[PDB]
């Protein structure tokens, strides 16, 4: 069983960028509903119970033929990743480790911002937008994804999360999703969280270079 983890900030800490009413509906019943549905499903099978959270997401994905438990398990992971992906007084310019990595696999931060926005702008329907670290390619990429699927099923480590589900922003921005993406990238995106996520990914990706002797 997985408990409903609260965001690391008070529900009113994102004002006026994200109003408290959105927080109380996105986490009070939306994220709680996903959590409660999963626990009922996990209470019947002793096999899906026992997997880790990343194991359960990949196991229930079933190689493109998702099990009934996939939607609930994958959605709660995305929301806790979404809450930690935003911090009060976020935005500005990422520094240090994220900085040269962004300008290495994208050319510069300016080319990254336009690439990230187009992924969310062209996302048709409810889905997610990701800045992930490719395990095999050892580089940062921007991936658009629909419904509850996350790049965990591709064995990729997410770094930054954005929710483009309508219920996430239909109160303060409604159908004006274009400015909602810009505000998230300007006042809400947490690059401090991207520090440790790309630090945690360093235990599995090793984005550096080897020291090769001259002999």
């Amino acid at each position: 069983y997985y408990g409903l983890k609260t965001p690391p900030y008070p529900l009113d800490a994102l004002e006026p960028y994200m109003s408290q009413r959105t927080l109380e509906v996105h986490w009070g019943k939306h994220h709680r509903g996903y959590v409660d549905n999963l626990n009922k499903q996990l209470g019947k099978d002793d096999r899906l119970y026992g997997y880790t959270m990343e194991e359960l997401i990949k196991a229930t994905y079933n190689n493109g033929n998702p099990l009934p438990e996939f939607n609930n398990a994958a959605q709660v992971y995305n929301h806790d990743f979404f809450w930690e992906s935003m911090q009060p007084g976020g935005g500005d310019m990422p520094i240090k480790g994220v900085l040269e990595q962004i300008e290495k696999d994208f050319g510069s931060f300016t080319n990254f911002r336009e690439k990230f926005t187009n992924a969310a702008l062209t996302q048709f329907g409810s889905g997610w937008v990701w800045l992930v670290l490719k395990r095999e390619e050892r580089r940062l990429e921007v991936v658009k994804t629909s419904n509850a699927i996350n790049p965990l099923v591709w064995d990729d480590i997410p770094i930054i999360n954005l929710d483009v589900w309508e219920h996430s922003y239909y109160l303060d921005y409604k159908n004006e999703r274009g400015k909602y993406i810009n505000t998230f990238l300007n006042h809400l995106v947490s690059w401090n969280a991207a520090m440790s996520r790309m630090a945690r990914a360093e235990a599995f990706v090793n984005l550096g270079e080897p020291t090769i002797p001259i002999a």
Binding site: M53, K96, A193, R197, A215
Partner: protein, 315 residues
């Protein structure tokens, strides 16, 4: 020539760049030894370090998909093989309600094929039929009735090429399940940095939280935080349910991967180490993957890249 199958290794004095941009021939600026590391296919189940414990009148007739049955004279060739646009006969089928697409088609010219007899026997009553026919659905048995894989190209490592030469009490075990610290925004706690990661992924507000020693707490089901000492290394044993101390506070002769010659001595009271590379290092022994060195004077040409598989008799 290679006296045994294996892979090539050189340490120094062999040019890494091929003499020609398209070849695999390397030169020796100086004198060096070329090593051959001895070694013994699905590409989906066989992968690196896999341990293999096993070795590698019409109413009487019928028409169906790409085939039909015949109880007008039928002509079949001697070999029983039909060619395209051939004449075999000059209302043959019950005109079934449903008919699928067939590569074969009848115009009687058979154009799109074997032919064998079909005989049905019941209580001695014999009648023969002529059968002319050509994903899982298109299928036209009954349940009722050593070595280790080395991939990078496959080599088998086994005993034919690898051989062995040679508070409460503190105990190794779990210290509990680490929990996420919300100050670091990580689902699974980092617990540690390195000289490259600490410069790369340390936030400004986290500068004061780095510690040069281990400080361990403990939280029970009620949310209380327990340490039992703020300046020592104390953790709780999950099994015996008792506190105990850590080992360090976390502030041999033969090395792994080294190559030996045939009569290299390690001690006066020890047998000579033999040729090969140190594969496994243990408490009191090492396991050696046997290798054969070849002496090569300057100007010699190495026939093969690094780690290239050479069979017996190969130059």
């Amino acid at each position: 020539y290679s006296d045994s199958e294996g892979e090539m290794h050189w340490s120094t004095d062999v040019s890494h760049a091929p003499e020609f941009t398209y070849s695999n021939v390397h030169l020796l600026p100086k004198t060096s030894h070329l090593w051959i590391l001895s070694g013994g296919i699905l590409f989906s189940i066989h992968k690196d370090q896999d341990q293999m414990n096993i070795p590698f009148s019409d109413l009487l007739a019928k028409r169906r998909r790409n085939r039909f049955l015949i109880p007008i004279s039928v002509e079949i060739p001697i070999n029983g093989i039909f060619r395209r646009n051939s004449i075999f006969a000059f209302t043959l089928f019950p005109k079934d309600l449903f008919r699928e697409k067939d590569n074969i088609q009848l115009r009687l010219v058979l154009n799109w094929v074997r032919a064998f007899f079909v005989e049905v026997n019941t209580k001695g009553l014999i009648r023969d039929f002529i059968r002319i026919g050509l994903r899982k659905r298109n299928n036209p048995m009954n349940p009722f009735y050593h070595g280790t894989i080395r991939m990078f190209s496959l080599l088998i490592l086994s005993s034919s090429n690898c051989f062995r030469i040679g508070t409460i009490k503190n105990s190794s075990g779990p210290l509990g399940t680490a929990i996420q610290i919300s100050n670091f925004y990580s689902f699974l706690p980092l617990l540690t940095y390195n000289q490259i990661s600490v410069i790369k992924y340390l936030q400004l507000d986290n500068f004061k939280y780095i510690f040069q020693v281990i400080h361990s707490y403990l939280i029970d089901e009620n949310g209380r935080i327990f340490n039992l000492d703020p300046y020592s290394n104390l953790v709780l044993n999950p099994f015996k349910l008792n506190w105990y101390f850590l080992h360090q506070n976390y502030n041999t002769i033969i090395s792994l991967g080294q190559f030996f010659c045939e009569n290299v001595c390690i001690a006066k009271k020890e047998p000579y180490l033999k040729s090969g590379q140190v594969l496994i290092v243990q408490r009191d022994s090492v396991v050696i993957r046997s290798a054969k060195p070849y002496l090569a004077t300057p100007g010699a040409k190495v026939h093969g890249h690094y780690r290239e598989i050479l069979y017996e008799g190969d130059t």
